[PDB]
Amino acid sequence: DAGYVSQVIGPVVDVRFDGELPSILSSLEVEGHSVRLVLEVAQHMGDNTVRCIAMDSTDGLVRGQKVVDTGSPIKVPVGRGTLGRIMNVIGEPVDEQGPIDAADIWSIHREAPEFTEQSTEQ
Amino acid sequence: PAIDAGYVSQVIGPVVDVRFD
Amino acid sequence: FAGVGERTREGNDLYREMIESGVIKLGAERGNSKCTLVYGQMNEPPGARARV
Amino acid sequence: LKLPTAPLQLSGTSAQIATLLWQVAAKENQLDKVQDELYQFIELFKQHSELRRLATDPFVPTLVRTKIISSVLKDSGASEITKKLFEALADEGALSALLEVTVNYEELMLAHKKEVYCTVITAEPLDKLERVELTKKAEKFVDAGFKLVMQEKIDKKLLGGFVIEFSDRRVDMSTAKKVEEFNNFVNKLVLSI
Amino acid sequence: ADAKALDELRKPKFSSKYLIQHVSQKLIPAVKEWEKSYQPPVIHLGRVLSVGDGIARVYGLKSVQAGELVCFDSGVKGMALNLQADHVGVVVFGNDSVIHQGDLVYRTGQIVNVPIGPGTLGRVTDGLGQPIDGKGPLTNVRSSLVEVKAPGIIARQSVREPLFTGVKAVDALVPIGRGQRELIIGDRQTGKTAVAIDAIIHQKNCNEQVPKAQRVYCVYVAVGQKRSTVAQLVKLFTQTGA
Amino acid sequence: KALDELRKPKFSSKYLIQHVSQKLIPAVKEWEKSYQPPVIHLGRVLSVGDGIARVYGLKSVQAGELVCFDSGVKGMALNLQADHVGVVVFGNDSVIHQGDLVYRTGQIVNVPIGPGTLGRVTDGLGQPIDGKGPLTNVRSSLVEVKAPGIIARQSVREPLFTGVKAVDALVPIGRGQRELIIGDRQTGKTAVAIDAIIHQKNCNEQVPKAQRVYCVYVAVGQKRSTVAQLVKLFTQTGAMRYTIMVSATASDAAPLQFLAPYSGCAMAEYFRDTGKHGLIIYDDLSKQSVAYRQMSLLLRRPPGREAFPGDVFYLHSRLLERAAKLSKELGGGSLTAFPVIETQAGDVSAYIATNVISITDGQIFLETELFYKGIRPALNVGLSVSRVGSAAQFPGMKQVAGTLKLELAQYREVAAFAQFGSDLDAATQYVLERGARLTEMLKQKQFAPIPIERQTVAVYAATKGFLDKVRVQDIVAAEEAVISQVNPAVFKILKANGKITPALDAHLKAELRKVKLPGA
Ligand SMILES: Nc1ncnc2c1ncn2[C@@H]1O[C@H](COP(=O)(O)OP(=O)(O)OP(=O)(O)O)[C@@H](O)[C@H]1O
Ligand SMILES: Nc1ncnc2c1ncn2[C@@H]1O[C@H](COP(=O)(O)OP(=O)(O)OP(=O)(O)O)[C@@H](O)[C@H]1O
Ligand SMILES: [Mg+2]
Ligand SMILES: [Mg+2]
């Protein structure tokens, strides 16, 4: 269920899951770190191992630290509750005004809309 | 003189590899 | 405002300028604010600067 | 801590496993037991498909491969050396390196058993005075006190004589190359003289 | 290690049977008790060995043709470009996130097809031929290869008949024949699409004056532009009648 | 044949024998009684070379954790690979052998910071090399720290007076921005930074304790004799009690040169976190990027443009973003960074030069063509930007700085027209000679910082034509005559009141009329 870190090189962390790998672009939470570190799966390496890019600094990562999957991309607090707040990249308040009100919680990765749903109104 | 007498392992131009026991 | 990878100093300048001009409102009148700042400035490692 | 030295040095990353295996089985003096066990595992890979599926398939998890190699090698009087070797080689997916760790182990044991091979290829079946006169001329090519064995092959292309195949040097004492170097030696003089 | 010392293990050389006799009866329940943690072995099928940046390396696929449309079990198609010794490196037509390490890849037996014919005249398709304007699937159309061979030396005649572009400088200085590969080169925002669209509108205008064999049907290929620019070109061609 | 699938090996690892030998050497029956080296908290060196050791073991090590070899030399665990750890070496790698033990220390990289660091010529790791003993009144903080956020900063208000007339008028520097001094070799970059240090010695004895500036000079990749001469110079002026000398020279190992500006930034962030003001000069930052390039290329990382790694923008970004002006809730401290980037024959479109220009607010482009025209400091006034602008410019200097910028802007375009000696225009000649007056006004000898009030008076006397009667060749001494022959009261009240008041601009307008100029 939970996987462990296999390799730390720079801001790129190779996480080894034993069974039922997360998808690409999925958000991974490293448990045991001091600052809340969030990994995003960039690709699958090929031997039950994904290769993630780190949102915070990798200074202080141990090989074997348990990393839990969230089954989704980076979910941010969105909506009317974010107005006047300064959000982080992982959706955290950095304006020191408390937690964010949540209209909805949306994943930051999505599709381009369509060709049909466009506006040619200059 | 078995120990502290290594043999040349490989040679690439001016770069010589010695392997020791 | 999705400030991607600029300096932190100009982000703080924008935050203070929108505090004083009436765009970002703090306190209990926060519901009348009309801007959400998103900052991924130069201090952060490039995953954060790539996804902000 | 105190490992006996291997008789001949070798290459890396598959010959090093054979060097360590010869060192450990020479500390335990089971040097021909584990060679028989590795031969048995080579033919065991040859027999069934569910065992070579543990070495060619990249979608087998390492947990079931480690537990299969432990629960199979639990019994049948297997050596501790071969058991822990196959545990360490199945934990890292290196079961396909068996076929080229055992060859370097055989080269190491052939260096130790103090026995070097050869192959004499001939045109006629050799008679017993041809053979005992062959061993005296072929022993002059080995370089120490060894146990040079003499294999026999028959090939009609030679017009008599013998060619020694030491697998690293070749002595062509045949007549078919004698007449081939004869006809080359004449035509370098007819163009000159 | 060499091959000469490695071929000689193909002959049996054990001279003892205290291992191969006993464990040959133990191995089958040992692989039976881990039947759940397996995956069914792929020979003529394909299993994804790894995936990254829109490129999936597929183990298996013993009978793909180089350039064959493979179709993943996620419903996304692929194209086997390079065939390695042990795996197949396919590309991914679209979202790579719906492909995990361990998916199944089924080959289709099709060198990459696109629907060609009279029925696709007036349609906006994507790079694979599927329509994106959304007025039903393509009717009166047939599939053909995307990588056909170019016609040879006998199969061409001299470029004689002129292609009027409707631009004064093109028809006055650099005149286009009706079989001529002509490059429209320049910098960014200089009017290359302008000359292109002017040529297309002029072939519309001239197609309603020539008798039925000199009618030239344009084709526009938008590679890497915005969806809004292609929608603007669709609205422009529809308000002109092209 | 059924044997062909297992013919060639498919290894998922490189040090496979090192994992096999941790399981075959216990298969000897006599070697089960604690005959095993532990790798839970220890580590064995596999391959040494070129200041890079690859260590098997270290299962509980952290990325960026300072480990210690059993030879005594320390090292930073940088690449945490799947089967080993790529450990850089903070010293000579001649003392390391294959099979040596690596004892991890559990600590991310630490340097002694505090008030006892003042005057201490230290390395990029913390050992003082000046021979005055260890560091006494210090505490051990981290090297790599998180930069302050968006809440933690406030607007750059108070100026940092440099003492150089070419930069205090045109390219003004506030207490808390990052100002780059970019140029070529032997163009005046280190001299501008040293003048910025020595003016803090001239200034700190006139301001209270909360307004003092404690300099930190980070000599990366320089000679040892250059830092010896600079320590001799800072002691000869007496500015060592405000200056910390962080010095990883060219003899020192490549990770020491890599970590020297980070160590210096940690030693200078103590004054920023305690309400004081700090000034740091990462001298020769290009040599720090070169040292990081070498340390990464020996660590098998794929190189990019000019064989630098990808994250070398991040290397200078996370170093420079720690220089800020904190808010009053966090102490009101400041750290003013001064990176120094050397270009090669004016290629400003290089990799590291464009990255540091993209990071920093200002830039001081010193050109090697205008250095030999007699204009020393060699400030190219056209390309130099200061993105605080007049928000942190000295008042009084703001009254004449717009005139100076506009008149030098017209003098920069009057060029390519002065080579025709009969072609008089009598209006382009006036701005053409005015630009020569202002250009030769802004010259300074080195190691001679002028206080800001005398700079404002001296440039007021030139932008208003009180040195317009002299020739173009005698303005270097007429400047000193104007500084000396005025009343000492003018500087004394101009330093105190903050601006040129209407109750002063009639006094020194007349005090320039009782001056003697050596030319008429
Ligand atoms: N002959 C012309 N007369 C007037 N305007 C023109 C002419 N040709 C082009 N333009 C104008 O120039 C602008 C750019 O034209 P166009 O989009 O064709 O350039 P482009 O090379 O396609 O740029 P890009 O390749 O970046 O899309 C358009 O807004 C168009 O209206
Ligand atoms: N105001 C000045 N007046 C006269 N000479 C100066 C002035 N400023 C600098 N110089 C001279 O210019 C030279 C500047 O050398 P500097 O200290 O800039 O070396 P650098 O360019 O930083 O590094 P490198 O030694 O690698 O070129 C010094 O030798 C100094 O004598
Ligand atoms: Mg275009
Ligand atoms: Mg210098």
Over F171-194, what HEC string results? CCCECCCEEEEEECCCCCHHHHHH
Here the CATH number for the domain that contains residue E106 is 2.40.30.20
D153 with D133, same domain?
yes
Question: Please, are residues F417 and F435 in contact by the beta-carbon 8 Å criterion?
Answer: no
Q: Please, which residues bridge with residue E46 across strands?
A: E60, E105
Cα–Cα distance measured from residue E8 to residue E89, given in angstroms and rounded to the nearest whole number: 34
Cα–Cα distance measured from residue A21 to residue A44, given in angstroms and rounded to the nearest whole number: 9
CATH class of the structural domain F394-520? mainly alpha
- Terminal CA-CA length for chain F: 107
D106 with D148, same domain?
no
Nearest C-alpha neighbor of F314 from the set E180, A54, A121, E85: A54
Ligand 2 pocket member F343 (CB < 6 A) = no
Cα–Cα distance measured from residue F163 to residue F193, given in angstroms and rounded to the nearest whole number: 10
**Residue where the block lists tokens 């079989």:** E179
- The 10 Å Cβ neighbour count of residue E124 is 19
Cα–Cα distance measured from residue A57 to residue E31, given in angstroms and rounded to the nearest whole number: 44
Question: Please, are residues F343 and F378 in contact by the beta-carbon 8 Å criterion?
Answer: no
Nearest CA to ligand 1 atom 18: E191
Question: Please, are residues F74 and F321 in contact by the beta-carbon 8 Å criterion?
Answer: no
Question: Please, are residues F441 and F479 in contact by the beta-carbon 8 Å criterion?
Answer: yes
User: In angstroms, what separates the C-alpha of E87 from chain D's closest C-alpha?
Assistant: 11
Directed axis angle between helix D62-72 and helix D49-56, to 10°?
140
Query: In this structure, what token pair is assigned to residue F283?
Result: 């001298």
User: Hey, what amino acid is at F253?
Assistant: A
Q: Which residues contact E17 (CB under 8 A, 6 or more apart)?
A: D40
Q: Which residues contact F73 (CB under 8 A, 6 or more apart)?
A: F89, F90, F91, F92, F95, F96
Cα–Cα distance measured from residue D138 to residue D144, given in angstroms and rounded to the nearest whole number: 13
Integer angstrom CA distances of residue F133 from F91, F111, F230: 21, 16, 20
Q: Which residues contact F212 (CB under 8 A, 6 or more apart)?
A: F200, F204, F242, F276, F277
Q: Which residues contact F4 (CB under 8 A, 6 or more apart)?
A: none
Cα–Cα distance measured from residue F172 to residue F390, given in angstroms and rounded to the nearest whole number: 8
Q: Which residues surround ligand 4, an ion (CB under 5 A)?
A: F 190
Mutation site, D17, D33, D47, D102, interface F, largest F CB count within 10 A: D17
- For chain D, give the number of residues: 193
Q: Burial code of E162-180, b = ≥16 C-beta within 10 A, e = fewer?
A: ebbbbbeebbeeeebeeee
Cα–Cα distance measured from residue C11 to residue E146, given in angstroms and rounded to the nearest whole number: 51
Integer angstrom CA distances of residue F458 from F400, F409, F518: 11, 20, 16
D1 with D77, same domain?
yes
Cα F336–F337–F341 angle (5° rounding)? 155
Cα–Cα distance measured from residue F74 to residue F103, given in angstroms and rounded to the nearest whole number: 9
Domain residue limits at D51: 1-112
Tell me phi and psi for residue F304, to 5 degrees.
Answer: -115, -135
Q: Please, which residues bridge with residue E176 across strands?
A: E163
DSSP summary character for residue F325:
B
Cα–Cα distance measured from residue D85 to residue D58, given in angstroms and rounded to the nearest whole number: 21
A95 neighbourhood in chain C, CB within 8 Å? 15, 37
Return the SS3 of F379: strand
Cα(E200) to ligand 3 centroid in Å equals: 15
Q: Which ligand is nearest to the CA of E198?
A: 1
The separation between CA F77 and the C-alpha centre of its own chain, rounded to angstroms, equals 26
- Terminal CA-CA length for chain C: 10
**Residue where the block lists tokens 């005698």:** F474
Q: Where are the beta strands (DSSP E) in F254-339?
A: 277-283, 334-337
Cα–Cα distance measured from residue A34 to residue A62, given in angstroms and rounded to the nearest whole number: 12
Directed axis angle between helix F428-441 and helix F397-413, to 10°?
120
Q: Please, which residues bridge with residue D120 across strands?
A: D152, D164
- Terminal CA-CA length for chain D: 71
Q: Which residues contact E48 (CB under 8 A, 6 or more apart)?
A: E56, E57, E58, E59, E72, E99, E100, E101, E102, E103, E104, E105
Query: In this structure, what token pair is assigned to residue E82?
Result: 């390079």
Nearest C-alpha neighbor of F85 from the set F299, F295, F311: F299
- The 10 Å Cβ neighbour count of residue B20 is 10
Integer angstrom CA distances of residue E183 from E152, E193, E204: 21, 12, 21
Cα–Cα distance measured from residue A54 to residue A71, given in angstroms and rounded to the nearest whole number: 17
Cα–Cα distance measured from residue F133 to residue A86, given in angstroms and rounded to the nearest whole number: 48
Domain residue limits at A48: 1-73
Cα–Cα distance measured from residue F358 to residue F125, given in angstroms and rounded to the nearest whole number: 28
Choosing from F185, F241, F300, F387, the catalytic residue is F387
Q: Are strands A27-30 and A38-44 parallel, antiparallel or unpaired?
A: antiparallel
In 3-state terms, chain A is what percent helix, strand and coil (to 5)? 0, 35, 60
D118 with D153, same domain?
yes
Nearest C-alpha neighbor of F394 from the set F448, F452, F450, F438: F452
- Residue ranges matching CATH 1.20.150.20 in chain F: 394-520
Residue ranges of the binding site of C: 6-7, 10
Q: Please, which residues bridge with residue F53 across strands?
A: F48, F87
Question: Please, are residues A106 and A78 in contact by the beta-carbon 8 Å criterion?
Answer: yes
CA-based max dimension of chain E: 93
Q: Which residues contact E173 (CB under 8 A, 6 or more apart)?
A: none
D27 with D5, same domain?
yes
Q: Are strands F277-283 and F334-337 parallel, antiparallel or unpaired?
A: parallel
Cα E49–E53–E59 angle (5° rounding)? 15
- Residue ranges matching CATH 2.40.30.20 in chain F: 25-107
Cα–Cα distance measured from residue E191 to residue E170, given in angstroms and rounded to the nearest whole number: 13
Cα–Cα distance measured from residue F496 to residue E220, given in angstroms and rounded to the nearest whole number: 74
Ligand 2 pocket member F286 (CB < 6 A) = no
Query: In this structure, what token pair is assigned to residue F512?
Result: 């320039």
Nearest C-alpha neighbor of F114 from the set F143, F146, F144, F141: F141
Burial (0-12, 13-18, 19+ Cβ within 10 Å), E61: buried
H/E segment holding residue D170 = strand D170-172
- Residue ranges matching CATH 3.40.50.300 in chain F: 108-393
D8 with D96, same domain?
yes
Query: In this structure, what token pair is assigned to residue F78?
Result: 């940088």
In 3-state terms, chain C is what percent helix, strand and coil (to 5)? 50, 15, 35
Query: In this structure, what token pair is assigned to residue F213?
Result: 């500036």
- The 10 Å Cβ neighbour count of residue F383 is 12
Cα–Cα distance measured from residue E15 to residue F428, given in angstroms and rounded to the nearest whole number: 107
Question: Please, are residues F390 and F405 in contact by the beta-carbon 8 Å criterion?
Answer: no
Ligand 1 pocket member E184 (CB < 6 A) = no
Cα–Cα distance measured from residue E240 to residue E237, given in angstroms and rounded to the nearest whole number: 5
Cα–Cα distance measured from residue F178 to residue F336, given in angstroms and rounded to the nearest whole number: 6
- For the domain F25-107, what is the CATH code? 2.40.30.20
Looking at domain F108-393, does it have CATH number 3.40.50.300?
A: yes
Domain residue limits at E94: 24-110
**Residue where the block lists tokens 């361990």:** E102
Question: Please, are residues D89 and D98 in contact by the beta-carbon 8 Å criterion?
Answer: yes
Contact A97 C26 (CB under 8 A): yes
Q: Are strands F340-342 and F179-183 parallel, antiparallel or unpaired?
A: parallel
H/E segment holding residue F75 = strand F74-80
Ligand 2 pocket member F194 (CB < 6 A) = no
Q: Please, which residues bridge with residue F139 across strands?
A: F113
- The verdict on whether F513 is a catalytic residue reads no
Q: Please, which residues bridge with residue A97 across strands?
A: none
User: Hey, what amino acid is at C1?
Assistant: F
Given in angstroms, what resolution was this structure solved at? 3.8
D24 with D60, same domain?
yes
Cα–Cα distance measured from residue E93 to residue F162, given in angstroms and rounded to the nearest whole number: 60
Domain count, chain D: 2
Q: Where are the beta strands (DSSP E) in F109-223?
A: 110-113, 121-122, 139-142, 179-183, 213-220
Here the CATH number for the domain that contains residue A45 is 2.40.10.170
Cα–Cα distance measured from residue E84 to residue E234, given in angstroms and rounded to the nearest whole number: 42
Question: Please, are residues F150 and F324 in contact by the beta-carbon 8 Å criterion?
Answer: no
